[PDB]
């Protein structure tokens, strides 16, 4: 039975091992003692005497039948406890008594059955309470709440509970400052009657798979009239039983309330319409769908004030054509539907990301595409096929641009990047491209990351296409398939300090290419075939080198160019893993380290 | 290595073992049993984690008659407001859930079909469990 | 003034070359004497007297004013005059006198006025008669095309025929055997008196860009009736002024009519519907259509009788839904506008080619998709993005498939090709594929044609992937950037007689590899960087060997492996080009044929 | 070699010279001239041909001010029905025709841009002739 020590001293973890008694055999001064799954059934006054220090405590399926009064006494700084799946069918008055500071506390599928009769009013400092998976019944909050200041979670999901009444919650109303980010969800409940949620607040609410039918969710969304959640979450869940109709009068009533927002996480059914439906959810300043089936529908153009639009995972038939005058981020990703684009107004927008859907642009990217003039960011990566007719006119302000993974088009027919100068980043890697054009990065003044691996070259020979790009900083060229570099490729660029040239087809090193680069750092040449110089002409290298990655090369281990390999006992100083640098060429010499074979020739 | 059933058909007799050093047990069922060849059907799970079902994904490393494919990476629950409900689980909570599925399209042929299943999850990605699924097929 | 002599004393062309009397000094037997653009102001009789035998004779731009009596006397087996250009004012009778065998005649943009005082009467064997660009009045025919049988095509358009009565084409009445594709094209028209054409047979009709208004086009179609032409040809010319509405009514009447291959050339208006449109135009075993935008429709699908369908060049918004009970080819190739698939039903369909439109398929390719079973070729090459979801199921007959250069996904995660038993080619070049699974091409048992230059491999390790396919006889593998091969690859191929393996990245020859190849003719290795060996156990290749190239990659000319350099003027029954394999290696030893610098050491 | 204007405008100064031995003339019109920031108007065209305006297409090597471009393969005038009426001359057969042209959605920039066009048609596929344009540029 040894207690493994995750952190010296400081933190044992003792899990399955099993205990049928507190490991009192263990350092004294102890932080975050795992001790879960150990079969404690019964637990005594002052169990954790042993530990005066303690900051995490877990109990998780120690099948703790009841917790005897005055434990955990000598114990405090003990900020989280975590009794889950624990049945306690007699919890003792008084218990939880010694607890100083106490702030998370998680009592998830334990037996309960309310919340009038639970020991936890003394507490302070306490600010999550899970309470979920359990068995209450009525939503009536019990009054030490009121002394219970500081709560900012209360999450009782997957409760029985029924329905609610009027002079249920008469706490709150008696609340200055309350956070309470409430979340009811699977909860089987019929009835709402009104005025029972009033003058009330909350901070979030949660009610998703709740209502077994339209009629149902109809009414009790009459329920809750004036209610002014800050942000609301209805739904389903994909796992269970779901709702068989939803159309324009559900959803209705909604109205009555103050959300600012808004959030539908799932719908079974393949909705086909959006307006006469979501109506009474305008003026919420962050609107959101997930998951939801609208396929066939022609009538997305309408005005909505929805400072925050997000369609996660959603599926269509078309490319829904949004007009929203006021819309400033919108999140279209991991879409499944409609393959195509179209252009959209979003006439103050800022931020945008198309990714992972795969779509396809044949009117490419242009302010005629998108409406708006001050796009900061745009991610078309990972889309479909992407065709180049306009290089972006109108977006003169686009700091980020990712292309990673597309499929680009007509890419050397001109200067595709001709417009953006305030651009930082430029992610281009792995588009299917044959730079043929020596006038390919034009007008990208400001880019200082250029990443580029897997893009062809023509006739693989490097050419001259990193001019006027002075603050490049960091270079990626990688699976470029380069078998020679022009001798003057990498001036004017004197900002460069890493240096990516590996994994392409290279058999002679030299410094000249080099001889004037003052910010280099890192120069890397791992996946190469490099045997053999120019002749011994090669240089010194910078200063400010300070690595120089030469591994998983071949070599060629005979007297002749055993200069070659004195050249590379030049630099110890400036070597970086000299175990996967060894011989290839001969057959006795196999596997050796070069700088350790010490011949004459 | 103890054998783990699942079901018959037609064309497939689904089974799985462990992989890594615990063993903690799982219970899966499907009904009805997949005919290789475009099915539907239930999956019934009955669990009890020893880690967070948060961030939770398969690493599926197909093998096809001794072929080996590449690496699969399937991401069940992503952080907020999963399809899901299972993927709200802690540690030591029972989860006993229910997911439909169903696919057609696509031929196969015979031979020794392997898949090694590797759960990760938790706020530190550590993993979950292994299993090891062997699917034989033999189309009538 | 030299006459080129194109063909050794048989044909002789003197353009340009200032003449003004025809090259007597000229060897005795010619044929094909080109004359074109020498002035010739005026011809006299038996002019060609010194070429007794002529079979082509070309007076292009020779300003002819003139053409006297008897000229060409002398002069049989002359089969072609093209008469292109001359402005001839003053034909006499009786000229074009002694032709025996002539069958071309080409008068084109030479001033005529009429046909009846056109000297061609006694003319037989006279197949073609181009008269275009000509000033023509009334298309009466002349009486002497009774005895003129062997005429086949007859064009004369751009000319200045007004309109048509009905003893016009009183001839035409009396011809048991008569084909004649005539075609009037750019022919302002602007009336056709009813029943003029009537009991009449063509075997093709164009009448392009000659209607200036809808009522015009209406009610000459009415003109029409009872024609029985077995080819229409409909449209205007991108060139021109055109007209400015089409719809509906326009093109009825066009059924009194016996049609039986139709088509619409050219359409500047954005036509919006096919059908009540194009109504009588069924029953036509070939319809097609090109040039012409019809943008925004839904309604294609209809029953028509169309054995031959093709859509070339055409615009779109969506993809059109096509439903032809009766349907056996089709082109939609070159299209531009809608970028998509959506599955189409064509029962009876055996011809599909779907070639540089760019559309996309989510759907892939499956007997769902096409509706059809017995699909013999498939060309889906040039497009977008192609997304494997399905095997090729229920398409088990189909010996031809190309994809090159779309881009395939998923193509390594299944067998893509397992159903197809029946296939002799593929073609899967220079899509962005990434070959990782042993199983890629299993499934294709009878192919012969395999090409994929471009693909990577895992890697770069060429896997045992060429199992099963035993009739393969041509291999493309080049710039899939291979740098080692599985000693055993290429087994089980005993008729694969051309074996491209050039433009990758080797390093060392050996035999061993093709030591059992019993069939193979050409072994191509020339853009390597191939340098030296295993060791010299490399052996005589098989006997079938009959080419060895290579060419074009680096050498290393020093003392050792110079047994490898042995071993290259080992055969020299094999190799190809020994002019551009040379030396690379030293700096001394530059540009040096191997086989050549005798040296001992 | 003798130069050939064709039209100023704003920001172009459009002109050609003869490639090959032979020096055919030929006429070329355009209005109004094109803006190099999209344009639209109509080119009239006025030429004899030495061979058959038939499968024209155009070769054309790009010059971006001492960068090339790829070569660029144009073709007019496919076989059956073409889109044109020109494409149907012969030989001596005066072609006079007008042909409307617009673009719009590019960005250039200045220097000398230069174009070598080379037309070919025929039977045999021998070239019409060659052109060499020379277009300079500066935005207002
Ligand atoms: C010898 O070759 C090595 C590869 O073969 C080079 O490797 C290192 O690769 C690591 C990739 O995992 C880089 O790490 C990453 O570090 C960056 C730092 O900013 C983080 O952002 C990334 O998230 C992180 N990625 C991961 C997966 O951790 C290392 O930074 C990089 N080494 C250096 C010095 O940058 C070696 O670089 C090369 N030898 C030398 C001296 O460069
Ligand atoms: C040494 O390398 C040469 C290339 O570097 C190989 O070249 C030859 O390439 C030609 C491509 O133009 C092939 O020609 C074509 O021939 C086929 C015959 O069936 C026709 O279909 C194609 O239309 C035609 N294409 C063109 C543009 O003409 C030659 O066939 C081919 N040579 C041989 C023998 O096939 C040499 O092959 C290689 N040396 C040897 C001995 O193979
Ligand atoms: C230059 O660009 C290359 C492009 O790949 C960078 O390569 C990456 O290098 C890392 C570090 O070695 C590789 O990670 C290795 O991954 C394996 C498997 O995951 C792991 O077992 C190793 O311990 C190591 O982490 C990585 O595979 C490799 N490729 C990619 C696509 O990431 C390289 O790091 C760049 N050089 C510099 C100096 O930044
Ligand atoms: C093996 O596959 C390669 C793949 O390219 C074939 O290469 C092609 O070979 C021909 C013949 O040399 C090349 O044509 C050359 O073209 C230039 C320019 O057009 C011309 O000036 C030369 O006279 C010659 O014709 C061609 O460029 C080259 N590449 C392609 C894409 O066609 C090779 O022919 C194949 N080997 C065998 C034996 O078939
Ligand atoms: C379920 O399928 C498995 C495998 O197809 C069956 O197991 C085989 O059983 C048959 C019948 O007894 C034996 O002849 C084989 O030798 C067994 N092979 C293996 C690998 O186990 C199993 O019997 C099937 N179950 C039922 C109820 O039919
Ligand atoms: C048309 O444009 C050309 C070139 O832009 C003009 O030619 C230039 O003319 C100016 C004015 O006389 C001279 O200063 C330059 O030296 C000329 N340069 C070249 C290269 O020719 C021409 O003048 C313009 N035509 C008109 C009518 O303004
Ligand atoms: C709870 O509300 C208070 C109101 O001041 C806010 O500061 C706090 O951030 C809220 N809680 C959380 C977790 O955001
Ligand atoms: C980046 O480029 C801009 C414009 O060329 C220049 O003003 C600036 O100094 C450069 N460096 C940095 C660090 O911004
Ligand atoms: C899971 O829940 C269902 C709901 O009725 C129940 O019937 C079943 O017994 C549960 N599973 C277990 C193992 O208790
Ligand atoms: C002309 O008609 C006859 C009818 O027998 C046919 O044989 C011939 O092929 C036709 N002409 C051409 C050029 O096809
Ligand atoms: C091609 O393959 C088929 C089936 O494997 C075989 O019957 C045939 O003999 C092979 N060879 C030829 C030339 O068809
Ligand atoms: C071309 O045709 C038009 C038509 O009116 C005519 O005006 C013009 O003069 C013609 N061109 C020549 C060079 O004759």
């Not at chain 1, 939503?139 to 209360?154: A, G, I, M, Q, V």
């Not at chain 1, 302010?367 to 992407?386: A, C, E, M, P």
Request: hydrophobic share 40%.
């Amino acid at each position: 039975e040894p207690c493994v020590e995750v952190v010296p001293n400081i933190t044992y973890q003792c899990m399955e091992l099993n205990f049928y008694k507190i490991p009192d055999n263990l350092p004294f001064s102890t932080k975050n003692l795992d001790l879960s799954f150990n079969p404690l059934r019964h637990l005594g006054s002052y169990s954790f005497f042993s530990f005066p220090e303690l900051q995490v405590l877990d109990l998780s399926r120690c099948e703790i039948q009841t917790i005897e009064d005055g434990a955990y006494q000598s114990l405090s700084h003990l900020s989280t406890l975590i009794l889950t799946g624990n049945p306690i069918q007699s919890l003792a008055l008084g218990a939880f008594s010694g607890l100083s500071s106490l702030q998370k506390l998680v009592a998830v599928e334990t037996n309960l059955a309310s919340l009038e009769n639970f020991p936890i009013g003394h507490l302070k400092t306490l600010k999550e309470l899970n309470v979920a998976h359990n068995l209450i019944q009525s939503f009536k909050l019990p009054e030490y709440f009121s002394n219970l200041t500081n709560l900012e979670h209360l999450d009782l999901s997957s409760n029985k509970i029924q329905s609610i009444y009027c002079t249920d919650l008469r706490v709150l109303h008696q609340m200055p400052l309350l956070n309470l980010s409430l979340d009811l969800s699977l909860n089987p409940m019929n009835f709402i009657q009104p005025g029972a949620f009033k003058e009330i607040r909350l901070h979030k609410l949660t009610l998703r798979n709740n209502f077994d039918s339209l009629n149902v969710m109809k009414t009790c969304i009459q329920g809750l009239a004036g209610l002014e959640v800050h942000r609301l979450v209805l739904g389903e869940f994909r796992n269970e039983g779901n709702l068989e109709k939803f159309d324009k009068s559900a959803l209705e009533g909604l109205c009555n309330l103050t959300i600012e927002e808004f959030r539908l996480a799932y719908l079974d059914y393949y909705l086909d319409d959006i307006i006469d439906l979501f109506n009474c959810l305008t003026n919420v300043s962050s609107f959101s769908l997930v998951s939801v089936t609208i396929e066939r529908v022609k009538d997305f153009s309408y005005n909505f004030g929805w400072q925050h639009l997000e369609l996660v995972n959603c599926k269509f038939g078309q490319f829904p054509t949004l007009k929203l005058k006021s819309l400033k981020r919108l999140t279209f990703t991991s879409n499944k539907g409609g393959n195509a684009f179209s252009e959209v107004d979003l006439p103050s927008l800022e931020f945008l990301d198309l990714s992972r859907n795969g779509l396809s642009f044949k009117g490419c990217c242009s302010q005629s595409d998108f409406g708006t003039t001050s796009l900061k960011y745009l991610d078309l990566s990972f889309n479909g096929v992407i065709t180049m007719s306009s290089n972006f006119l109108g977006l003169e302000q686009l700091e980020h641009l990712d292309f990673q993974h597309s499929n680009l088009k007509q890419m050397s027919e001109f200067s595709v990047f001709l417009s953006l100068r305030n651009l930082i980043y430029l992610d281009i890697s792995h588009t299917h491209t044959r730079v043929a054009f020596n006038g390919i990065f034009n007008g990208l003044s400001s880019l200082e990351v250029l990443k580029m691996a897997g893009n062809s070259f023509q006739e693989n020979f490097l050419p001259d296409i990193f001019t006027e790009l002075r603050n490049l900083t960091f270079l990626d060229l990688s699976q470029c398939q380069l078998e020679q570099l022009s001798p003057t490729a990498f001036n004017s660029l004197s900002s460069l300090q890493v240096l990516n040239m590996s994994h392409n087809n290279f058999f002679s090193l030299d410094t000249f290419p080099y001889k004037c680069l003052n910010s280099l750092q890192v120069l890397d040449y791992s996946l190469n075939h490099i045997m053999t110089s120019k002749k011994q002409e090669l240089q010194h290298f910078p200063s400010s080198l300070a690595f120089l990655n030469l591994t998983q090369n071949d070599f060629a281990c005979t007297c002749e160019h055993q200069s070659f390999l004195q050249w590379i006992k030049d630099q110890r100083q400036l070597l970086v893993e000299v175990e996967r640098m060894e011989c290839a060429t001969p057959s006795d010499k196999q596997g050796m380290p070069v700088l350790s074979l010490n011949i004459t020739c | 290595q103890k054998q783990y059933w699942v079901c018959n058909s037609s064309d497939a007799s689904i089974s799985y073992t462990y992989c890594d050093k615990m063993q903690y047990p799982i219970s899966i069922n499907v009904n009805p049993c997949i005919e290789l060849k475009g099915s539907k059907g239930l999956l019934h799970i009955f669990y009890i984690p020893r880690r967070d079902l948060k961030q939770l994904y398969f690493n599926l490393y197909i093998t096809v008659n001794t072929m080996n494919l590449p690496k699969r990476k399937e991401v069940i629950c992503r952080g907020s407001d999963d399809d899901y409900s299972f993927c709200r689980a802690l540690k030591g909570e029972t989860v006993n859930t229910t997911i439909s599925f169903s696919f057609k399209g696509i031929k196969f042929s015979k031979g020794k079909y392997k898949c090694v299943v590797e759960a990760i999850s938790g706020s530190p990605e550590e993993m979950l469990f292994c299993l090891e699924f062997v699917i034989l097929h033999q189309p009538n």
